């Protein structure tokens, strides 16, 4: 065994269980085990063996809570028999699960219109407040919608860009302008949201 069973998070948040054998014959057999029960290729687990490199892999799209536990690859090649086990319990499980969830959601988010910088505010002009954000992967069809307190606020609709700044000018800022501002980006590729609680005293 060149390396024992280990688990890492890949791009798109995929979960990769892998180990490396020094050598495989091409006639090797692997059994995959989770919490003392054999598991099989299908909608949940995908398995791969690369003969030349000795790499044996199992992939998952994400970790459900019930996926906490002990994983074993049982390897048989000729008379040689080995196993390698990883225990995914406690903090390591939580960390893997959260990292997978975060990376998967981030990859998805980025395939559509999304925020690069979330809402912030500045003062400009004659005591005005400008709300601003920075967005990316916008297309002509993308809807950009601004709200205060769940009520739409109309702005000029000129996003003749893919990446850029979106702003909302609040003229003569006063108490009536306090509230929860939101900007939604959306098209058939995805939806992203930003929020800003603007107070006045």
From Swiss-Prot:
Superkingdom classification of source: Eukaryota
Domain Ig-like C2-type as annotated: residue spans: 113-199
Locations listed in the record: Cytoplasm, Myofibril, Sarcomere, M line
Assembly with partners or alone: Homodimer. Interacts with TTN/titin. Interacts with PNKD.
Biological role stated in the UniProt entry: Major component of the vertebrate myofibrillar M band. Binds myosin, titin, and light meromyosin. This binding is dose dependent.
Protein name per UniProt: Myomesin-1
Native organism taxonomy: Eukaryota, Metazoa, Chordata, Craniata, Vertebrata
Gene of this entry: MYOM1
Section of the entire sequence shown: 1247 to 1446 of 1685
């Amino acid at each position: 065994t060149k390396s024992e069973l280990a688990v890492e998070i890949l791009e798109k948040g995929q979960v990769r269980f892998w180990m490396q054998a020094e050598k495989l014959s091409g006639n090797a057999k692997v059994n995959y085990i989770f919490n003392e029960k054999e598991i099989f290729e299908g909608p949940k687990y995908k398995m791969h063996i690369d003969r030349n490199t000795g790499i044996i892999e199992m992939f998952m799209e994400k970790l459900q809570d019930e996926d906490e536990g002990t994983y074993t690859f049982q390897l048989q090649d000729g008379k040689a028999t080995n196993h390698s086990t990883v225990v995914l319990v406690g903090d390591v499980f939580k960390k893997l699960q959260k990292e997978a969830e975060f990376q998967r959601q981030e990859w998805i988010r980025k395939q559509g219109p999304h925020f690069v910088e979330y809402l912030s505010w500045e003062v400009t002009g004659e005591c005005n407040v400008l709300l601003k954000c920075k967005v990316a992967n916008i297309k002509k069809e993308t809807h950009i919608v601004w709200y205060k307190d769940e009520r739409e606020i109309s702005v000029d609709e000129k996003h003749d860009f893919k990446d850029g700044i979106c702003t909302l000018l609040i003229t003569e800022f006063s108490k009536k302008d306090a509230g929860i501002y939101e900007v939604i980006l959306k098209d058939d590729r995805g939806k992203d949201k930003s929020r800003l609680k603007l107070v006045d005293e």
